[PDB]
């Protein structure tokens, strides 16, 4: 065989219910499950002006 599917990211029952309610892609909240995730990050006060500022003029990896 030339190409074979070995994996498909699939949401848990809970993540899929949450996504479906919002008509989001079924895997939308999967970023929440992985070693890298810290957590909320509860308070979002950031504005557009400072977010642009935090870029420090660097647009590319």
């Amino acid at each position: 065989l030339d190409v074979l599917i070995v994996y498909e990211l699939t949401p848990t029952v809970e993540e899929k219910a949450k996504a479906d309610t919002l008509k989001l892609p079924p895997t939308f909240f999967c970023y929440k499950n992985r070693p890298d995730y810290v957590s909320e990050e509860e308070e979002d006060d950031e504005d557009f002006e400072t977010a642009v500022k935090k870029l420090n003029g660097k647009l590319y990896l």
């Binding site: 030339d2 190409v3 599917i5 892609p25």
Partner: protein
């Protein structure tokens, strides 16, 4: 001879493939479109920013192990 590629959508969908290093990459696209259940012409597949030609081969693109292919919805300005 053989590598694993991660195909990632901008919708967060992700499928991994075992692919022969010498194969025509359209087979990957067909398989992927077959799985998602959408026409082949409705999707665009990119590697390192560049479109993937049906006859391109993982070797010819210099694809390493666990490299990522990004897939986008086909679109046109109006």
């Amino acid at each position: 001879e053989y590598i694993k590629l991660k195909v990632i959508g901008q919708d967060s969908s992700e499928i991994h493939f075992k692919v022969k290093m010498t194969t025509h990459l359209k087979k990957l696209k067909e398989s992927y479109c077959q799985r998602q259940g959408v026409p082949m012409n409705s999707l665009r597949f990119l590697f390192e920013g560049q479109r993937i030609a049906d006859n391109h081969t993982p070797k010819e693109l210099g694809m390493e192990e666990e490299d990522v292919i990004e897939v986008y919805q086909e679109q046109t300005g109006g």
